[PDB]
Write a protein that binds this ligand. Structure first.
Ligand SMILES: CNc1ccc(N(Cc2ccsc2)C(=O)Cn2nnc3ccccc32)cc1
Ligand SMILES: CNc1ccc(N(Cc2ccsc2)C(=O)Cn2nnc3ccccc32)cc1
Lengths: 304, 304
């Protein structure tokens, strides 16, 4: 028992991290097979970030201008190209540590682990969720760009995020591994405000199920509700509308605990309406929304 | 910016995890050089755990009874011995993935990362603190025994914890890598209750400094206090007494923010006395105590 904000083991990703330098800018890259992926803003100075013309800036760069170092060994760059907001640097050596991998574009509400890196070296790992406004609440400092988000299915690493920027709000924006930004964000130092950060209702319910499994049951009540009634309450509290798909995904958690999904919705409704009254659930004094139903089952079963 | 419960990158430890089986019991082991470390209760059945005589149980075991598998390859066991509550299995092959490492016995209040494992395979990583009552609040299921806690100083892995048991309270107990339990716990399925779980005051203050660095400053007030006055309040709230050593360790955080340690103590005093009034600090609605002052500096500087 016990429930923690657990990240995937980061070893398979640590073996892919490299340092990429272009001119005076150094950030992280992801070396998979014979390609190194990195944010295209590596070709910019801080002066360029106000209104960069990436196609024009890239014309002034040749293969030899991209310095790629894997630990202490220099990779030879034999090609470069821009795909959306990422640069793909073809190198002459396939990464011997390349794991089985996929590039996936995740949905808002889905979770992933981030291996924060600086100068191609890993500093730490933590679990994230793609917010419904397509930002992530990470922990990134200057030089962390190119750090990636991923999930792991036994031996396969699904890369879903590459860090590009911190919004003036202190929240983070980035792309999938095809270089497409999540949300409306652009790689320009401009006024970009994130939309309403709604709470991921299906994840809060999954976390309530995790709480019941792990012994925290004080919040269970004698009530039930309907999807429409629950959603009137979810709207008032800036919670995502709950759908039948969400109820279906909570099915295994419902079956394991014997608590019908709508009954858990009624517990959640009372918690929204009455607050925690100074009490805690799984060591938290707020409703946690960064565990998916899949995460709860994975953690409560012991998948390796 | 942003502040997260960050774990160390787990790659160097993932390369050490193996599966150890003795009879019908399978748990995790730690392979470093030519030795595999694991909990001695691997020699027990659940029947034995009520009152085990480990020396007597071990006499019935030979080197060939300890099955050690590293991924899919079997290690040859050429020696075995019991050191306190751990077994050390001498194998004929040095682990090629052995990192630079040390065995350290940590102090209560200190933090570490845990790589939860099952059947020698890693499932996830999370950040912990050794509680002042010498328990850890982890996420462990049956088969997780032998999973280890560690810290990393650039290339050196300091192993500090090996998981042994879950107390009837849902909290966790284990040993250092010399097999000595943290706290008064014994590897016997018996009545063992943890003492008072006090809050790690120096860590809460470190986290308040992290909050100010990252922009959450609402809790700063116009007051100051003294160590003796603060400690009268800390006692009332089951917080650890703050010492001059703790103030000294907070020195760098104080210098960086310009907020004197006793002034932060006065903010903490008001937060203890008045609560958060429905507000949050670094996304938490309670006072976080599982970041040391070293953790805050490390995360806020970008150490790899
Ligand atoms: C020289 N090149 C350069 C490139 C990028 C940045 N910017 C601004 C920006 C605008 C549009 S895309 C990126 C970043 O946001 C970087 N970054 N990322 N995460 C960060 C956390 C803390 C501090 C900085 C961080 C700055 C300089
Ligand atoms: C057959 N051998 C055996 C050995 C140990 C255990 N016990 C009881 C126990 C008493 C004294 S030392 C250990 C554990 O506590 C194992 N364990 N650890 N973390 C756990 C989380 C969830 C469930 C079980 C967990 C049980 C069986």
């Amino acid at each position: 028992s016990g429930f923690r904000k657990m990240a995937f083991p980061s070893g398979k990703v640590e073996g892919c991290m490299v340092q990429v330098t272009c001119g005076t800018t150094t950030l992280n890259g992801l070396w998979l097979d014979d390609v190194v992926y990195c944010p295209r803003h590596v070709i910019c100075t801080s002066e360029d970030m106000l209104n960069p013309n990436y196609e024009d800036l890239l014309i002034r760069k040749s293969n030899h201008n991209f310095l790629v170092q894997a630990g202490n060994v220099q990779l030879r760059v034999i090609g470069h190209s821009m795909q959306n907001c990422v640069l793909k640097l073809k190198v002459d050596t396939a990464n011997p540590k390349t794991p089985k991998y996929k590039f996936v574009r995740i949905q808002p509400g889905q979770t992933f682990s981030v291996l924060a890196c600086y100068n191609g070296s890993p500093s730490g790992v933590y679990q994230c969720a793609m917010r419904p406004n397509f930002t992530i609440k990470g922990s990134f400092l200057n030089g962390s760009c190119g750090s990636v988000g991923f999930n792991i299915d036994y031996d396969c690493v699904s890369f879903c995020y590459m860090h590009h920027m911190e919004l003036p709000t202190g929240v983070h924006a980035g792309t999938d591994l095809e270089g497409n930004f999540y949300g409306p964000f652009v790689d320009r130092q401009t006024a970009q405000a994130a939309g309403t950060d709604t709470t991921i209702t299906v994840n809060v319910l999954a976390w309530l199920y995790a709480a019941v499994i792990n012994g925290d049951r004080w919040f269970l009540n004698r009530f039930t509700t309907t999807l429409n009634d629950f959603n009137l309450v979810a709207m008032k509290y800036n919670y995502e509308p709950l759908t039948q798909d969400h109820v279906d995904i909570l099915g295994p958690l419902s079956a394991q605990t014997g608590i019908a999904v709508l009954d858990m919705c009624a517990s959640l409704k009372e918690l929204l309406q009455n607050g925690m009254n100074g009490r805690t659930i799984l060591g938290s004094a707020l409703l946690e929304d960064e565990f998916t139903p899949f995460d709860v089952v994975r953690q409560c079963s012991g998948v390796t």
